Amino acid sequence: KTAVDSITQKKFLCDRTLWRIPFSSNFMSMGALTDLGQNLLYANSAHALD
Amino acid sequence: KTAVDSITQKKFLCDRTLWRIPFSSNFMSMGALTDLGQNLLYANSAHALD
Amino acid sequence: MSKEIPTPYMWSYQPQMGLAAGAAQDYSTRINYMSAGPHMISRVNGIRAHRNRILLEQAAITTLTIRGRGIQLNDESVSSSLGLRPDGTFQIGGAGRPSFTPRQAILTLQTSSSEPRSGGIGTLQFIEEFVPSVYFNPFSGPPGHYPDQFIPNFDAVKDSADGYD
């Protein structure tokens, strides 16, 4: 009955893992040699990265 | 006739304004896209500013 | 290294202007055979020679219901339904059937730009045109005979663009 006003705090804990952002056109794991990694754009030309 | 010795102070006021330091060769406004903006060193490389 | 089987040079793109920036030897895909004997070393050299042959050659030789714009649209000229027009007497309420006039609407919708462009190159054409270039005997000429396109800080008209102004 005498409950006080309140807010909500949300967080997630993930331990023991690595975030992964695969270099694929649709993020799927279709092979060891990712399809976008052999695309002509990123195979012949050289690009900077930020 | 009986004025006392004096020392001069100078100051200036400039409100409702922004100082500008254009990124152009001769500081002029020779266009929106300044020539230094198209200078190949600033266009095909990376740099750090301090 | 060797002036006959050289590691290729790979161009760098500047997306923004559309021109091609300076290039460089490929430095991310080298093979480290420094722990191999003459057999595998000759094999690897032959492989790099094969790669160079592939590059040179490639470069040199290889350079009703109109679709509208992805959703087809039908086309009618005499589809005029509401033949009435409001004269002094009539009073036409809400109406309107959107129909593309064959000549006016469609042609006006698919005209190209008024005058074609003259400037930089898009991404696809850059990929098709600027293959990695194999430089055989590097810098073997007198000064001024070198390929200046490779240096990114070099401007074609005004030579040797001074960085930092």
Next chain:
Amino acid sequence: INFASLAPRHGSRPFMGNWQDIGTSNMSGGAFSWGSLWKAWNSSTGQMLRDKLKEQNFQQKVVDGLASGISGVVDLAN
């Protein structure tokens, strides 16, 4: 496909505006016309009211909508 009929007619001749007028403005290098041209402790009364009248109205040179006024000379404040 000619849109001249849509324009106002200045007499047997459509009033086609200059094609070189499509907007472009940014922070520096872009300037537009019509600039900001402009219990009395002091009882003068006169010039005061006159000045207030001046303050509420206007004058410049590219205000050439319609006519400049009779005999002429070409002047400044461009």
Next chain:
Amino acid sequence: FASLAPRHGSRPFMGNWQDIGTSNMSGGAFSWGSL
């Protein structure tokens, strides 16, 4: 041609053909610049 014009150069100083004019209070104006 006309020789009766101020000459600011060897070439004469002549205005636009289309110079003759009108305005009615109306708003039959409220029209744009000389430019």
